[PDB]
Design a protein around this motif. Structure first.
Motif, mmCIF file in Angstrom:
data_model
loop_
_atom_site.group_PDB
_atom_site.id
_atom_site.type_symbol
_atom_site.label_atom_id
_atom_site.label_comp_id
_atom_site.label_asym_id
_atom_site.label_seq_id
_atom_site.Cartn_x
_atom_site.Cartn_y
_atom_site.Cartn_z
ATOM 1 N N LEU B 52 0.942 -1.256 0.176
ATOM 2 C CA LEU B 52 0.056 -0.152 -0.083
ATOM 3 C C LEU B 52 0.862 1.344 -0.092
ATOM 4 C CD1 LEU B 52 -2.416 -1.480 2.895
ATOM 5 C CD2 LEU B 52 -2.748 -1.445 0.302
ATOM 6 N N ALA B 53 1.848 1.249 1.119
ATOM 7 C CA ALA B 53 2.578 2.506 1.013
ATOM 8 C C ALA B 53 3.453 2.886 -0.034
ATOM 9 C CB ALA B 53 3.370 2.457 2.286
ATOM 10 N N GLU B 56 1.177 4.584 -2.656
ATOM 11 C CA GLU B 56 1.167 5.828 -2.125
ATOM 12 C C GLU B 56 2.243 6.944 -2.729
ATOM 13 O OE1 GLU B 56 1.671 6.702 2.049
ATOM 14 O OE2 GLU B 56 0.332 8.695 1.993
ATOM 15 N N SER B 97 -9.546 4.108 -0.679
ATOM 16 C CA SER B 97 -9.252 5.361 0.062
ATOM 17 C C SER B 97 -8.247 6.351 -0.753
ATOM 18 C CB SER B 97 -8.544 5.026 1.588
ATOM 19 O OG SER B 97 -8.218 6.036 2.446
ATOM 20 N N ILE B 98 -7.211 5.572 -1.390
ATOM 21 C CA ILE B 98 -6.289 6.241 -2.147
ATOM 22 C C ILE B 98 -7.017 6.948 -3.302
ATOM 23 C CG2 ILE B 98 -4.078 6.635 -3.276
ATOM 24 C CD1 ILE B 98 -3.273 4.350 -1.375
ATOM 25 N N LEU B 101 -8.772 9.973 -2.369
ATOM 26 C CA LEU B 101 -8.131 11.185 -2.164
ATOM 27 C C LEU B 101 -7.671 11.559 -2.896
ATOM 28 C CD1 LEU B 101 -6.962 13.109 -0.030
ATOM 29 C CD2 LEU B 101 -5.481 11.360 0.725
ATOM 30 N N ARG B 104 -10.200 13.991 -4.547
ATOM 31 C CA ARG B 104 -10.269 15.107 -3.950
ATOM 32 C C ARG B 104 -9.009 15.939 -4.226
ATOM 33 N NH1 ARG B 104 -13.256 14.966 0.794
ATOM 34 N NH2 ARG B 104 -14.593 13.225 1.127
ATOM 35 N N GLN B 164 -0.770 12.738 2.225
ATOM 36 C CA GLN B 164 -1.702 13.293 3.199
ATOM 37 C C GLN B 164 -0.952 14.564 3.500
ATOM 38 O OE1 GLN B 164 -4.632 11.498 5.400
ATOM 39 N NE2 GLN B 164 -4.660 13.359 4.385
ATOM 40 N N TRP B 167 -1.871 16.948 0.405
ATOM 41 C CA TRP B 167 -3.281 17.403 0.845
ATOM 42 C C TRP B 167 -3.293 18.861 1.288
ATOM 43 C CZ3 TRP B 167 -7.608 17.607 -1.347
ATOM 44 C CH2 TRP B 167 -8.922 18.106 -0.322
#
Lengths: 59, 229
Positions: B52-53, B56, B97-98, B101, B104, B164, B167
């Motif tokens: 996952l990371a 990201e 989730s990613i 985001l 967004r 994050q 963002w």
């Protein structure tokens, strides 16, 4: 499931973004976690206690 | 795209027959409009199988490219460009989730592509002195957006940036870009030129009087775009 995943996931729930394990998004009632960890306190109680910050963010 | 070419000439004729003392009113060469690279906008591992990371870091790299208008490996800018609303296509198989985001974070890209298009199409001579300076002072803020994304690239090189933190860092310029893109949408939609695109910049500046994050933007834009009139 494991709590290390709950941390990374609820970190998005603070921003309000829907999560992997915490599927619900206050559509009916409030945020809710569905999992088979069956950790009475960590899977549910602590998670829901912290999710209302995300719910306030949603409002 | 093709439909603008008419509008430019139709405006040019009115000025030509109105004013004959000043002759051969200028035009730009055809390639200034034909060439698509001059304007801002135009081996892949299967993302499913990674941890996952690392997904990201990958999406962060692609978005840091998207912010300047250039396509990304895992996120594409849809080429429709119908009406004026730019749209983007994220890879289908990502973590929900990613993906959300990324959606967004994506509106600043749609509010950069339209903002640059406005600056190119409304910097030709035909649209008038005021519509020139509006784009010419929107162009400085485009440069400063480029400054910001360069600093973000440095931080990302040092492995010290995440989605994050991205963002947070893009919030102040998201408001800037949204104000510029909605303002450009209104200016183009109303076919406003001359003082019609000096009224709209006055009314939008009344629109935000207590905000003071977008008010300074609009006051600066109108200071610069009213130098011609």
């Amino acid at each position: 499931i494991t709590e290390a995943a709950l941390v990374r996931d609820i970190l998005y729930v603070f921003q309000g973004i829907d999560g992997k394990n915490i599927k619900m998004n206050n559509t009916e009632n409030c945020y809710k976690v569905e999992g088979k960890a069956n950790l009475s306190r960590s899977l549910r109680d602590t998670a829901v206690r912290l999710s209302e910050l995300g719910w306030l963010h949603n409002k | 795209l093709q439909q603008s070419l008419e509008l430019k000439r139709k405006m040019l004729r009115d000025k030509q027959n109105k004013k004959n003392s000043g002759q051969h009113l200028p035009i730009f060469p055809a390639w200034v409009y034909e060439r698509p690279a001059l304007i801002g906008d135009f081996t892949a591992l299967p993302i499913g199988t990674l941890p996952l990371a690392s997904q990201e870091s990958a999406v962060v790299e692609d978005l840091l490219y998207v912010l300047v208008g250039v396509d990304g490996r895992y996120v594409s800018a849809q080429p429709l460009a119908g009406r004026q609303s730019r749209t983007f296509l994220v890879d289908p198989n990502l973590d929900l989730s990613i993906r959300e985001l990324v959606h967004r974070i994506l509106p600043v890209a749609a509010s950069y592509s339209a903002v640059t298009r406005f600056i190119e199409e409304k910097s030709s001579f035909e649209y008038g002195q005021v519509n020139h300076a509006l784009a010419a002072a929107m162009r400085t803020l485009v440069k400063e957006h480029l400054i910001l994304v360069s600093q973000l690239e440095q931080l990302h090189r040092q492995g010290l940036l995440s989605l994050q933190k991205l963002w947070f860092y893009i919030q102040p310029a998201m408001r800037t870009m949204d104000i510029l893109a909605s303002l450009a949408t209104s200016v183009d939609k109303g076919e406003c030129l001359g003082g019609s695109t000096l009224s709209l910049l006055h009314d939008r500046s009344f629109s935000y009087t207590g905000d003071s994050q977008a008010q300074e933007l609009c006051l600066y834009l109108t200071k610069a775009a009213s130098a011609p009139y």
